[PDB]
Design goal:
Chain D: Belongs to the BIRC6 family. The structure is cut from a larger assembly and holds five copies of chain A. Helix content of chain A is 26%, strand content 0%. Chain A is mainly alpha-helical. Chains B and D meet through strand 1, strand 2, helix 3, helix 4 and helix 5 of B and helix 1, strand 1 and strand 3 of D.
């Protein structure tokens, strides 16, 4: 029953294909940082 | 004619030459070689008349003039001899006959053909009846010069044909196209890759005439050759392509072409890598290393702006320099190359000056009068408006021969002067054969234990996602053995081509479907590359799409994809795919073709070994470029 | 099936096992191939299925190995038509059947030792054919003398006769004598041997007598390898 | 007598090629030009890439090459 | 682009320029075809 009721989260050939098509990672540098206060100093340096 | 020239009509020695005809690649520069048979038939003063039919000559910022005389030769009545070469038609016909090896039982030596080509090139330059002879023997001239001779002969014939094209006679372009197409079927038997390079350069330029004929010829040859290429793939080559992305044939000793980089040096198998030692340098600059010579670069501690520095390279002997390549260096504004054998101030020659060396790499390809220098001065001028303290300028690569032939060193056969080796080369070739066989055996034994799990289960997918340590070590060993095999294959092909040079100095000759059967795999791959590029340019220059539909239909397209895209090299795969999109992407069966290919190649019952990832990337690209076709 | 295909190797292992259970089946096998025009697939199947004592005995008593060796010797010095393309397949067939010690003794016997000199004379043909024949001959001699003192003596005699060093001969000497001899080690255990295995799919089609599963292992190790290293390769 | 009529051995072909070769005029020619064309010293033109070391064997442009820059006069376009 | 200066002496400089222009035109045509 449990085998029926779960899907394998282990990576499979779909992940392998994604890798073929090119511990945790900081994604803050890729983002854009804004503030609701119009007078705030730009926070991109953060 | 203009009023001045009408007044001086009888005094004309070189007919009016369009200024644009003298242009250089830069677009705003150039040179006219004012010459004619009348100039040769004579012996103190001249007039250069420049008339515009800012406006006209006002756009001519700067002009310069030089005069060059004929070399002083011991031959008696040399002026009468030159009159003789220029006048008599029998002379041109017999030159053509000897070039075509249709005289004296075809025992004309390659050096003899080279001299005949020199004479023909001089004649074509002087003139602009010889054109009639060239057109009548065009097929045979092309055959002998592009499919049975070396890179140098092919380049010289390419120059001769260029001069002929530049010339009330029938247009030479169509006739050259017909000759090239008639010889196309012999491409599998072409002797050297550098020769095929010039052949295809000429064919690509002259294809503008009779586009349909060139298209059908290229398509037929490509279809014929792709089957043979696919039939020659071995399971080991498939394994190397798939597991490692290595597409060379390490177990096939025969190469066909070597390049460095129609934008790269070609035909480098016929020449040797030239080693050199830094002997003198300007200021505290030096060279550092950052068979082929190690990559070397000039380190300059202080570059400044517009500052000249120089490095002197000693090859250790007078070397027949034939090819040079210097990587583009943005740190300098210009690069000058001078060459001298005895001394800089004794026999110094300016080899080249490159002013766009900052935005283009320096490429001297197959110097037709190859210098016989020994010492090489590279003078680099730092970039203007730049004060980068330290500069690292890649010296580049230099090729040629370390064994000058008696005629190559001959100082009387040049413009503006200032058997034991064969035995040794054959011994070296045999040594390299043995070493390369040992390396191939090593690679074979290592690959026979290499296994590629199919991508049909999660465990194999994880194997590919995280390559296990033992797999990593096996791949490292395979890469090392494969690199050894490729280096030894390159050395073996270079040694074979040097041995052929020596046997060609000595009287000797270099050599339909059986042709394709007997061609080497690398020769077939080079032919396929050139044919695919020709077809792509054909479509770009587009009735050529009207033809290529009798061929390259659903079945032909599928066969071509299977033969070239699955097993071909990355470039062959890419170009075949893009050609197929441009040709059949708008066809109704196109989407069915893509789905059928996907089914056949990626269904789990397929045992064919191929680079699934690369073929899938190709399929995605092809489908994206044909997504306007509703059927995809 | 095409030759060298792993599926064909597995089917041929099944044929080998069936012949080992029913030796007469091998005769039927030899009957179905005509034991003349033997294709490379015929040679592969026969070599694989003949890897049993009874099967190898019947193969020798059929006269096919003798006919092959005589035809190869006739080809080299120039009753079956032999072309340069069949030399490498026949040499590979002889190597594969020489996996057996009986065929290894036969290959070094008086009837076969002329073939060694014939091969060396022939090599010391198209370039691809020459390369294939050279590789096949190196493999054939490596199999014949592999841990075989008598065949080692025979090959030493042949090489001394040849010498009484470049090209094929230098490569042969380097590969055969200046490389460590490799022996096949067959390890059985009452418990599984898990070390050295990869979870991914791998088709190792060896002779069926080497078993299957985790309790059997087959290694190809230099004779210099210490037994401790052998054990470390499996535990 | 003439090389054209003789058989094309390596000697005859070499003679013909030697006939076809060229050299640069060791002494520079003199030139008279319209006023709008104004000469420039060859050392100036080759300042970026000097040939002074080659001057010994008449390789510099000062011995065989003349140069003029154009002044955009009224009839300079003509 | 960066011709060898020795082609100036003979009558083959224009021919070599035309050959290089041939090669460059073919390269540009191929690049444009690949980037449709």
């Amino acid at each position: 029953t449990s085998t029926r009721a779960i899907v394998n989260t282990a990576r499979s050939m779909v992940s392998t294909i994604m890798k073929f098509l090119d511990g945790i990672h900081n994604f803050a540098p890729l983002g854009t940082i804004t503030s609701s206060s119009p007078t705030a100093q730009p926070a991109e340096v953060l | 004619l203009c009023p001045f020239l009408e007044d001086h009509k009888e005094d004309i020695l070189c007919g009016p030459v369009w200024l644009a005809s003298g242009l250089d690649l830069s677009g705003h520069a150039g040179m006219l070689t004012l010459t004619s048979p009348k100039l040769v038939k004579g012996m103190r003063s001249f007039l250069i008349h420049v008339k515009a039919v800012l406006r006209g000559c006002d756009l001519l910022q700067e002009v310069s003039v030089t005069i060059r005389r004929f070399k002083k030769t011991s031959i008696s009545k040399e002026r009468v001899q030159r009159c003789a070469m220029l006048q008599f038609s029998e002379f041109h016909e017999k030159l053509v006959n000897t070039l075509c090896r249709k005289t004296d039982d075809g025992q004309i030596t390659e050096h003899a053909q080279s001299l005949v080509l020199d004479t023909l090139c001089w004649l074509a330059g002087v003139h602009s009846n010889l054109l009639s002879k060239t057109r009548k023997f065009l097929s045979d001239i092309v055959r002998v010069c592009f499919f049975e001779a070396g890179r140098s002969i092919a380049h010289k014939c390419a120059r001769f044909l260029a001069l002929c094209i530049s010339n009330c006679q029938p247009a030479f372009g169509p006739v050259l196209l017909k000759a090239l197409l008639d010889n196309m079927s012999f491409l599998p038997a072409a002797t050297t890759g550098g020769s095929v390079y010039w052949y295809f350069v000429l064919l690509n330029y002259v294809k503008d005439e009779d586009l349909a004929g060139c298209s059908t010829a290229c398509a037929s040859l490509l279809t014929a050759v792709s089957r043979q290429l696919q039939d020659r793939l071995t399971p080991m080559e498939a394994l190397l392509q798939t597991r490692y992305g290595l597409y060379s044939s390490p177990f096939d000793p025969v190469l066909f072409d070597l390049e460095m980089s129609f934008t790269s040096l070609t035909g480098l198998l016929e020449v040797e890598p030239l080693h050199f030692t830094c002997v003198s340098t300007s200021d505290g600059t030096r060279i550092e290393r950052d068979q082929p010579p190690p990559h070397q670069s000039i380190i300059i501690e202080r570059m400044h702006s517009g500052a000249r520095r120089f490095v002197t390279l000693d090859f250790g002997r007078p070397i027949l320099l034939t090819d040079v390549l210097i990587p583009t260096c943005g740190d300098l504004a210009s690069l000058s190359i001078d060459i001298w054998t005895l001394g800089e101030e004794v026999d110094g020659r300016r080899l080249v000056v490159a002013t766009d060396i900052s935005t283009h790499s320096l490429i001297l390809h197959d110097l037709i009068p190859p210098p016989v220098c020994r010492f090489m001065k590279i003078t680099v001028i730092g970039r203007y408006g730049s004060t980068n303290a330290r500069a690292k300028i890649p010296l580049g690569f230099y090729y040629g021969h370390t064994y000058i032939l008696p005629w190559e060193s001959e100082l009387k056969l040049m413009h503006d002067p200032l058997d034991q080796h064969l035995a040794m080369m054959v011994a070296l070739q045999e040594d390299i054969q043995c070493r390369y066989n040992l390396a191939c055996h090593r690679l074979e034994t290592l690959l026979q234990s290499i296994d590629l799990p199919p991508l049909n289960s999660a465990n194999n997918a994880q194997y590919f996602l995280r390559k296990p340590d033992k797999a990593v070590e096996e791949d490292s060993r395979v890469f090392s053995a494969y690199q050894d095999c490729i280096q030894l294959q390159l050395q073996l092909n270079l040694a074979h081509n040097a041995v052929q040079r020596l046997k060609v100095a000595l009287g000797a000759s270099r050599k339909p479907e059986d042709l394709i059967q007997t061609s080497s795999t690398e020769q077939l791959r080079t032919i396929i590359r050139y044919l695919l590029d020709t077809l792509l340019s054909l479509l770009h220059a587009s009735s050529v799409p009207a033809v290529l539909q009798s061929t390259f239909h659903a079945q032909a397209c599928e066969e071509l994809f299977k033969h070239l895209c699955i097993s071909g090299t990355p470039k062959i795969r890419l170009h075949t795919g893009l050609l197929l999109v441009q040709l059949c992407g708008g066809e109704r069966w196109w989407g069915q073709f893509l789905s059928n290919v996907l089914q056949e190649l990626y269904n789990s019952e397929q045992l064919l070994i191929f680079p699934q990832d690369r073929v899938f990337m190709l399929l995605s690209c092809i489908g994206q470029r044909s997504l306007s076709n509703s059927g995809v | 099936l095409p030759c060298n295909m792993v599926l064909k190797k597995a089917v041929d292992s099944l044929l080998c096992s069936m012949c080992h259970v029913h030796p007469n089946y091998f005769s039927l096998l030899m009957g179905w191939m005509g034991i003349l025009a033997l294709t490379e697939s015929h040679l592969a199947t026969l070599a694989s299925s003949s890897q049993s004592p009874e099967a190898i005995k019947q193969l020798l008593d059929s006269g096919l190995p003798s006919l092959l060796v005589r035809s190869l010797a006739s080809f080299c010095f120039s009753k079956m038509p032999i072309t340069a393309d069949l030399v490498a397949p026949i040499l590979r067939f002889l190597t594969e059947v020489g996996n057996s010690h009986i065929m290894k003794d036969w290959l070094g016997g008086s009837e076969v030792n002329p073939l060694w000199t014939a091969l060396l004379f022939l090599l010391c043909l198209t370039t691809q054919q020459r390369t294939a024949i050279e590789n096949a001959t190196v493999a054939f001699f490596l199999q014949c003398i592999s841990c075989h003192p008598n065949n080692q003596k025979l090959m030493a005699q042949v090489l001394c006769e040849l010498f009484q060093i470049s090209g094929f001969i230098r490569r042969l000497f380097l590969q055969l004598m200046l490389e460590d001899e490799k022996v096949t080690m067959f390890l059985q255990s009452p418990c599984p041997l898990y070390k050295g295995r990869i979870n991914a799919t791998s088709h190792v089609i060896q002779h069926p007598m080497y078993g299957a599963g985790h309790k059997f292992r087959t290694l190809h190790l230099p004779v210099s390898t210490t037994l401790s290293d052998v054990l470390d390769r499996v535990s | 007598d003439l090389l054209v009529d003789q058989p094309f051995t390596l000697e005859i072909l070499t003679s013909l090629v030697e006939l076809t070769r060229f050299e640069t005029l060791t002494p520079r020619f003199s030139a008279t030009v319209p006023p709008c064309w104004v000469e420039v010293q060859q050392e100036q033109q080759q300042r970026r890439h000097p040939q002074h070391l080659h001057q010994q064997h008449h390789g510099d442009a000062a011995q065989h090459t003349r140069t003029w820059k154009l002044q955009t006069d009224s009839n300079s376009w003509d | 682009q960066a011709l060898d200066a020795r082609l100036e002496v003979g009558l083959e400089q224009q021919a070599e320029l035309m050959l290089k222009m041939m090669s460059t035109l073919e390269a540009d045509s191929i690049l444009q075809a690949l980037t449709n």
